[PDB]
Design a protein around this ligand. Structure first.
Ligand SMILES: COc1cc(NC(=O)Cn2ncc3c(=O)oc4ccccc4c32)ccc1Cl
Ligand SMILES: COc1cc(NC(=O)Cn2ncc3c(=O)oc4ccccc4c32)ccc1Cl
Ligand SMILES: COc1cc(NC(=O)Cn2ncc3c(=O)oc4ccccc4c32)ccc1Cl
Ligand SMILES: COc1cc(NC(=O)Cn2ncc3c(=O)oc4ccccc4c32)ccc1Cl
Ligand SMILES: O=c1[nH]cnc2c1ncn2[C@@H]1O[C@H](COP(=O)(O)O)[C@@H](O)[C@H]1O
Ligand SMILES: O=c1[nH]cnc2c1ncn2[C@@H]1O[C@H](COP(=O)(O)O)[C@@H](O)[C@H]1O
Ligand SMILES: O=c1[nH]cnc2c1ncn2[C@@H]1O[C@H](COP(=O)(O)O)[C@@H](O)[C@H]1O
Ligand SMILES: O=c1[nH]cnc2c1ncn2[C@@H]1O[C@H](COP(=O)(O)O)[C@@H](O)[C@H]1O
Lengths: 345, 345, 342, 346
């Protein structure tokens, strides 16, 4: 009762667990440095999403000072985007990124001369002709690293690299605010997607960015273990003070807004078919604390895997599949939490 | 320990995700024409269900104008069913369909004389002696395309085609209001159902109608991608103004009544054993808006699969299986939804 | 896992596949065998449980072509009186339950004219059960149903020692906790399939006991090899059921407990069933009708005019949790009750 | 093939399996529950209370040893208060008792041994590490006492610890009620598979496996042992009891007493640190003896169904099936509303 078009089972983060290794490294000893693109390096593998409710200059500066990096979003006029990147990199000469859309060549040139360090050429569907052509023209008119996405296949990864991609960004449907997989029925579970694209990208030494889906620090580890060089994360940071967003109080708890870029209110700035929704998140206050627990989680992970660098994590990692009942085991069960903890909201 | 009567794992829409392909086509540019039966074609692949709470002249004209078609139900006397066909057909010469049950041979005859374009010969169990007979009985006395259902096996569909079926409706159990799989314990998960029937029907150039189970626009893309020529929808249109039945209000919001044809009220028109229940659905106002975003979801899908027609969708589509945790990924997770979206409610 | 011997499936796990059919549900024959010598008109048995089956319930099943097993949780003559009342009423067929080593109880029941005796146990595949089985068969002319088991080997051995019927089911009952307290059991479909592979070779009927929630489960159970099903909770809420009706909301309930529960045992005892509560569903007859209606519907879709033909022609697919939600009513809110689906 | 080359297979946990009944001549009351705690120390029952500051101190340890099991005093205190605590147990009839220590705590260990502790539990969130192996070697060279080392979940960890003098191996990473390791670090192995793998190595060497964490119900005991463990370690069940340290609180009309991970913020204080446990509460379940009685009742019942008169016969004759979520629904109570609460089944 099985069909010719079934190409296998796809796995998400909650589907797997990482297997502990013989270890002689402490979590405090772990190197977290990583390549963002082929030519840009980072000291922590974290990237804040290119979203209007997540990353502007204040988020980027915060990211860059902690060793990561932020991608200013393109939902604004061209050189107000330039002002954002001028702010960050006048500020301690920190390293920063910016996003552009299909054929937005003028926007990109400006950002480059504003000193932006990486351009993220993003799209609902990176493995597309308009994307490929937009990438070729950039690399011919501009000397700057370009991350391209989003994609989820071998074929996409390979072809984008063959045309100049300095980084490949993975993820269709995994985001907290994404409805693509429901509206269009399209996607690939984030672990399998990162796996497929790693097996090609690593051949060329091109970094993969695992975009979307990250819910707990343990997910950061899984993503990297499987072949990512960094993760892009939206909803975790959208709770912080540094995200742009309007705070609201509905009951006894305070929230601020987090919406998809393919959401109706995002596209207005109708007869539209949206693939993102508009939502809120619990306000988690200060950035530096959220990021620290994320980094804490990853160090703990790599220690369990006896891996002192991302690169050693790739060599030594393995995982087991788990069931729904395995996941139940993995979470807290049968006891009732008396104090909120930042790790585990 | 496994058993010899187990013939495999049957999959439904939530069990899979369609995988992106290289695309040179934008959702805008996609063609959606399809074949309803081998001699009748539609310009969108959508059919409204033959239900007393879904389709009548008003729904049918609305469907036809949009480029689809409506099947007027048979929960009425013969002459009034004919009246319904005349209403749709005098209104712009639009295509329209009518359902008949087994042995209902003069009903069919009248309907055809009334200029109906297709007859839908329906039964809970399409693959039975009486349906075959009724089918051969219509083709001999009438010149009209006949759709036959419902079935879910490939031998069921081969045998209906051999006796003159112009289309086959697939679906046992998947309906929103269907209890056949619980009362009788019988059915096949809709994807596996469509796959098996496609593998026979397509070699004869006979269209598969995937009937029942559609919950979101991405479901439509899945159904067509694995072989369907079109889809039949009840509950999504049941809550439109153009639906028959009247609104009633329980709380803040108003609901419009949707029931099975196998429900007791439906068969009332009580020593009965029902395979359908009686329920309510959100009133979602005008159908045009409802349908508008179904079509947009499909286009979005076909865009992701680089397919500019259903033909190419058939050639190029592949899918992965996902776990229930992969499904938790695909939906919105960890964010509270601030405002309504008709795509996703 | 070395010890992993495969995946076991329950009723919710599968769907039956439709066959070419030329038989209407109304035309289907539901005759079957209880034991190799006792046959029924409908393949239903009410559970030998003190909240389910006494004389008023047993006479109820036989009425509709089935049978009920009077429970052993009473003294001998009172059980004997229960079987006398059913026999004296229309001469209808009835059964009664006894425990291990309770041979005396047994022929009192036999002398009272019981049609079938159910030798039951938490664990039918045990030395003591085989002992009692063997004395009974030597001192009494009676069909004996033995349980509960879930393996090929248990089925084979019980039959080799004289068993006239075999009850299958360890842990599926609505009120059972065995799989939680002991960690033991086998999912009901796989269990029936295992036991039918042996039992049908010998022409010994299997009773699928417990776990039945909807009429679709009856068809599944028979389709994979059972000759009948035993039913507790569906019937515990009926009128002809013993036990008592408490009102708590604006809806009516009556109690239903496991025979391995604290109240059913009366305390340093180790409970393996619980004390519970079930919606009152009025008169039995309507419940049975809807169950038979469901099964006739099932066999219609499979083009099977009898159980023997249902055995020959049935296949199933496995479904996910997601398939299961497709299968139930989804995304529509139900206006008022239906008997089938509640 | 959407199959990843780093995928080494499916891991299973207690709720994923069911034990299959065997022919039986033995009754639950006839079954032997003796087992080996460590290579040289043995118990009347396979139960061990957890080394947690909300579960085991002398009163719990005494209570355990009474019933034929053993308690492990937690290390979340100074050195000779832990010593005094094992003194309390030993002067209560020479009962068996154990004590936990951490990496490089050789001094504490020495003081524990001098006080007559029967076993030292060398614990760590990651038993398969350089500093644990070293600590094991140093203890074994300067002292004579059985050392249990954990926690691990792999064959090679199991092998490497035995090769360096481990007398018992404790299995479990992420399974516990108050544990968030698998969410914070994304690391662990489902408990059944974990015990299996570690059993396949340890049994050859005659080294007992202690199954640590994840026990929700008595039938989980039988499963851990049937798959190869010689004992199970239990926290949350006993945390609710009377002899548990931690003082009661009432929030509902129901009493609770607190239960926290040793890797919880509060426990570690005993803000700039990263939690792999949480701080919670459990229903007060009254006196210990009833709770332990029910768990033993359950196991005896398991072993009866499996026709196994001892743990070694259980290891030989056990088998299981994988079940699905729907199988688990079948297994729990269903379609019935519970009128009287049951200690078996909370
Ligand atoms: C690039 O062409 C395509 C576009 C779509 N759909 C969209 O672009 C919808 N959309 N329209 C605008 C946006 C957006 O800003 O951000 C998104 C992020 C993720 C997913 C979608 C969007 C988005 C579907 C298929 C194809 Cl082939
Ligand atoms: C075709 O004969 C059969 C009928 C049934 N049951 C029914 O059709 C009951 N029923 N009785 C009336 C109806 C109905 O109007 O619409 C249905 C839609 C789906 C499923 C059932 C019905 C329905 C079962 C098996 C067989 Cl073989
Ligand atoms: C004595 O044989 C055994 C008995 C048990 N347990 C019991 O019989 C407890 N019990 N004690 C009385 C009963 C009972 O009436 O019905 C039951 C149904 C299922 C499970 C248990 C019972 C039950 C478990 C294993 C074995 Cl090997
Ligand atoms: C140095 O060993 C490691 C320690 C950790 N983490 C911790 O020790 C955190 N922690 N820090 C203190 C504790 C603790 O007392 O009990 C625990 C129980 C289980 C899990 C963690 C703890 C715990 C992670 C990876 C490695 Cl390799
Ligand atoms: O509107 C949307 N629809 C679908 N995906 C989106 C949308 N907006 C952002 N995304 C993706 O979701 C990611 C954030 O995922 P999150 O960290 O799980 O919330 C972004 O980096 C984008 O790749
Ligand atoms: O009462 C019934 N029982 C089972 N299926 C039904 C019944 N009435 C209609 N159907 C089927 O369900 C389809 C609509 O399902 P929906 O789109 O999921 O709500 C119809 O087109 C019929 O094929
Ligand atoms: O207390 C008990 N513990 C476990 N199983 C029981 C107990 N009492 C009765 N059973 C079984 O459960 C069956 C009924 O289950 P039900 O039809 O699903 O509610 C009975 O026929 C017995 O086989
Ligand atoms: O804070 C912690 N994080 C992770 N595991 C812990 C922590 N504290 C105790 N444990 C483990 O959890 C076990 C008890 O879990 P339980 O029996 O399921 O409640 C203990 O025996 C330890 O192995």
């Amino acid at each position: 009762a099985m069909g010719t078009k079934n190409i296998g089972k796809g796995l998400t983060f909650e589907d797997i667990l990482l297997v502990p290794n013989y270890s002689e490294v402490l979590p405090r000893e772990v190197s977290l440095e990583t390549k963002l693109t082929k030519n840009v390096s980072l000291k922590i593998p974290l990237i804040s999403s290119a979203m209007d409710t997540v990353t502007e200059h204040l988020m980027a500066v915060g990211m860059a000072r902690l060793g990561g990096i932020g991608i200013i979003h393109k939902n604004m006029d061209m050189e107000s985007q330039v002002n954002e990147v001028l702010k960050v990199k006048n500020s301690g000469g920190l390293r920063v990124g910016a996003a552009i859309g299909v054929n937005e060549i003028e926007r990109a040139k400006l950002l480059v001369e504003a000193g932006v360090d990486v351009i993220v050429l993003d799209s609902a569907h990176g493995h597309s002709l308009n994307i490929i052509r937009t990438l070729k023209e950039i690399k011919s008119k501009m000397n700057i690293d370009v991350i391209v996405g989003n994609v989820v296949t071998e074929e996409a990864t390979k072809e984008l690299i063959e045309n100049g991609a300095d980084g490949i960004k993975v993820g269709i449907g995994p985001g907290s605010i994404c409805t693509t997989r429901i509206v269009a029925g399209v996607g690939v579970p984030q672990i399998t997607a990162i796996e497929k694209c790693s097996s090609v990208a690593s051949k060329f030494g091109i970094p993969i960015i695992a975009d979307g889906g990250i819910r707990y620090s343990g997910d950061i580890g899984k993503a990297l273990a499987v072949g990512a060089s960094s993760v892009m994360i939206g909803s975790i940071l959208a709770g912080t003070e540094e995200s742009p967003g309007e705070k609201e109080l509905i009951g006894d708890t305070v929230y601020k807004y987090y919406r998809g870029m393919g959401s109706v209110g995002a596209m207005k700035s109708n007869k539209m078919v949206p693939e993102g929704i508009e939502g809120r998140v619990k306000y988690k206050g200060e950035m530096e604390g959220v990021v620290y627990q994320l980094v804490g989680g990853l160090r703990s992970c790599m220690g369990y895997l006896g891996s002192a660098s991302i690169e050693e994590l790739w060599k030594k990692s393995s995982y087991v599949e788990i069931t729904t009942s395995g996941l139940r085991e993995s979470h807290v069960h049968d006891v009732e939490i008396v104090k909120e903890v930042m790790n585990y909201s």
